Design an enzyme around this catalytic site. Structure first.
Site, short mmCIF file in Angstrom:
data_model
loop_
_atom_site.label_atom_id
_atom_site.label_comp_id
_atom_site.label_asym_id
_atom_site.label_seq_id
_atom_site.Cartn_x
_atom_site.Cartn_y
_atom_site.Cartn_z
N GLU A 30 1.42 -1.29 -0.26
CA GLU A 30 -0.09 -0.06 0.11
C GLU A 30 0.82 1.50 0.12
O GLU A 30 0.91 1.93 -0.74
CB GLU A 30 -0.62 0.17 1.32
CG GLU A 30 -1.77 -1.33 0.68
CD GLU A 30 -2.95 -1.32 -0.15
OE1 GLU A 30 -3.59 -0.53 -0.44
OE2 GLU A 30 -1.98 -2.35 -0.52
N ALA A 31 2.29 0.98 0.99
CA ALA A 31 2.90 1.81 1.04
C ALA A 31 3.10 2.40 -0.42
O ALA A 31 3.94 3.46 -1.14
CB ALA A 31 3.61 1.85 2.32
#
Ligand SMILES: *[C@@H]1O[C@H](CO)[C@@H](O[C@@H]2O[C@H](CO)[C@@H](O)[C@H](O)[C@H]2NC(C)=O)[C@H](O)[C@H]1NC(C)=O
Ligand SMILES: *[C@@H]1O[C@H](CO)[C@@H](O)[C@H](O[C@@H]2O[C@@H](C)[C@@H](O)[C@@H](O)[C@@H]2O)[C@H]1NC(C)=O
Ligand SMILES: CC(=O)N[C@H]1[C@@H](OCc2ccccc2)O[C@H](CO)[C@H](O)[C@@H]1O
Ligand SMILES: CC(=O)N[C@@H]1[C@@H](O)[C@H](O)[C@@H](CO)O[C@H]1O
Ligand SMILES: OC[C@H]1O[C@@H](O)[C@H](O)[C@@H](O)[C@H]1O
Lengths: 261, 247
Positions: B160-161
């Protein structure tokens, strides 16, 4: 997948000082001019986009009224544009007539200013946010060594300081005209040097100039498309307390930025 | 393999790792008007996985297999054991971790599945350095009580980062403040809408960068911001790459 080809969308268009594109007095007559007006829910600020490159309010098409620069942008019967290619909107929010290359422009910042078709110089007064949400986006701007841009010297300069969540001067309001404004003083804009001898980015009263038009690119630069250059930490050294405009290059990481909102 | 270790885990090394992860994932990417790379699609199963190594504070390493089409974990290896999600592509076991003892986990690689099996949500799961290290430990020994939550931690701190610069920056803030956090509406709205944002950006080619459907992304004040076009910096300087969706 019909979703890959949506047939229309109704939204608003904001720009200079956060004001909206508005058909003056909701007048439906052909050649009814378009203005800046404070943003609201009225139908004469609703703009519907179609895959024929038209942009419509009150059933009529947004259009230039002359081939040469300086004339009003207007709404007109869409059948007059039957064979026309129409409007092209750049990545950075320049709205351009494809045939003539004139762009939607606001020559003043005040309510009821007439919008005009002008030669594109990438000025902030030629930058538009097509979108329903017209508010300035409050953010921090993170750069080299994970530091935050801060408004300094009584909101006249700007440089990197270590991030502190409370710190009032580390917050910026990104406006619909591509301006980066001091969050607690919205008449002041981050600006590229007005002195030929300096490359130093500074803070100045907003004036719709090329100097105050910034684009947050997907490659993570803060680009001034008029001067074909990007924001850079001087010498890749945050302790010099100088942010400058430079031609884009991956020399260090001084040209990489993050919007944290 | 691309890797990150607890030996040298700083804001800088984390940032470099995420940066290079995006690079590997966006090899052969297509591009649109937005100039945000679109991931590969119809990848032959032999080339569909990217291996990433994470090493904990015991110097034990797990290798995670990321599907290059959707940037989700398909499986992982720890020593001579490997573990596949229930929705991993069925032919993946013949291509990755072949010389290991393969197990299938009882759930899918989606947050919805993981939260149901874990009985615990992303909103209640802290993120930060200790939780990153701990998750690699729990996965290495495969302690089933902690596997689901460990995935919530790592899917977010890694994938997600990678997908979102806003999320990368939340993690960086936790690393150098040495302060844990739990994801709020800003972060979860991003995670939830990556696929929809992909579709709309790619569909918007035909409407001058205007979306078919508006997407609600929250800011850090828990205010919803309607993103109905590509002209929002909170999208276009945030989302690092997209799922393939439209020709
Ligand atoms: C874009 O610009 C051109 C004007 O330069 C427009 O095309 C002309 O439209 C006028 C007014 O109807 C016609 O009489 C001319 O014959 C057209 N000239 C050319 C060169 O085609 C066009 O209407 C504009 N389109 C929009 C959407 O603004
Ligand atoms: C904005 O558009 C309308 C429509 O053409 C013009 O009448 C305005 O002209 C200006 O105001 C009028 C009333 C008159 O004073 C004229 O000489 C002005 O220039 C125009 N407004 C502008 C150009 O500021
Ligand atoms: C909605 C609309 O068309 N309004 C017009 C109209 O009137 C104004 C009004 C409404 C409430 C209180 C005071 C005034 O006519 C105006 C011109 O006088 C203007 O076009 C306005 O946009
Ligand atoms: C445990 C669980 O929810 N399993 C789901 C299953 O319903 C679905 O068939 C599959 C689709 O790929 O995703 C997973
Ligand atoms: O004075 C101009 C105004 O006229 C009326 C209308 O509601 C406003 O949107 C604006 O056009």
């Amino acid at each position: 997948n019909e979703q890959c080809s949506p047939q229309q969308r109704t939204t608003r268009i904001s720009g200079r000082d956060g004001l909206c594109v508005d058909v003056y007095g909701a007048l439906t007559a052909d050649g009814s001019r378009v203005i800046l007006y404070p943003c609201g829910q009225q139908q004469n600020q609703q703009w519907t986009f179609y895959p024929d490159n038209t942009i419509r309010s009150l059933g009529k098409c947004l259009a230039t009224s002359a081939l040469s620069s300086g004339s009003n942008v207007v709404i007109t019967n869409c059948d007059y544009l039957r064979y026309d290619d129409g409007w092209m909107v750049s990545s950075s929010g320049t709205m351009m007539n494809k045939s003539s290359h004139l762009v939607l422009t606001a020559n003043a910042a005040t309510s009821r200013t007439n919008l005009t078709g002008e030669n594109n110089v990438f000025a902030a007064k030629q930058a538009w946010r097509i979108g329903n949400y017209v508010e300035p986006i409050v953010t921090t701007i993170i750069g080299l060594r994970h530091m935050c841009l801060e408004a300094t010297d009584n909101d006249t300069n700007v440089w990197l300081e270590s991030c502190v969540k409370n710190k009032t001067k580390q917050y910026w309001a990104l406006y619909s005209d591509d301006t980066i404004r001091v969050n607690n003083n919205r008449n002041l804009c981050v600006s590229s040097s007005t002195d030929s001898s300096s490359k130093l980015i500074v803070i100045r009263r907003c004036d719709g100039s090329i100097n105050q038009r910034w684009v947050f690119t997907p490659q993570g630069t803060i680009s001034n498309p008029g001067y074909e250059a990007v924001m850079d930490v001087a010498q890749n050294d945050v302790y010099l307390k100088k942010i400058v405009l430079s031609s884009a290059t991956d020399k260090g990481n001084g040209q990489q930025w993050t919007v944290f909102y | 393999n691309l890797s990150l270790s607890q030996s040298n885990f700083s804001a800088d090394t984390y940032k470099s790792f995420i940066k290079n992860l995006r690079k590997q994932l966006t090899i052969g990417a297509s591009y649109g008007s937005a100039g945000i790379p679109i991931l590969k699609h119809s990848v032959p199963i032999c080339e569909r996985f990217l291996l990433v190594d994470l090493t904990n504070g015991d110097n034990e390493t797990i290798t995670l297999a990321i599907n290059v089409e959707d940037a989700g974990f398909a499986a992982y290896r720890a020593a001579d054991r490997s573990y596949f999600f229930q929705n991993a592509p069925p032919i993946a076991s013949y291509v990755i971790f072949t010389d290991t003892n393969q197990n299938i986990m009882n759930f899918n690689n989606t947050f919805e599945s993981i939260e149901i099996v874990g009985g615990t949500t992303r909103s209640e799961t802290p993120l930060g350095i200790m939780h990153f290290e701990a998750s690699i430990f729990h996965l290495f020994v495969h302690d089933e009580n902690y596997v689901p939550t460990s995935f919530l931690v790592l899917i977010q701190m890694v994938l997600e980062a990678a997908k979102f610069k806003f999320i990368e920056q939340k993690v960086i803030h936790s690393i150098m403040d040495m302060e844990d956090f739990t994801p709020g509406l800003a972060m979860l709205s991003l995670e939830e809408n990556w696929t929809q944002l992909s579709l709309q950006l790619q569909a918007s080619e035909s409407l001058n960068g205007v979306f078919g459907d508006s997407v609600s992304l929250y800011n850090s004040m828990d205010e919803p911001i309607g993103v109905d076009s590509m002209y929002y910096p909170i999208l276009t300087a945030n989302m690092a790459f997209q799922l393939y969706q439209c020709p």
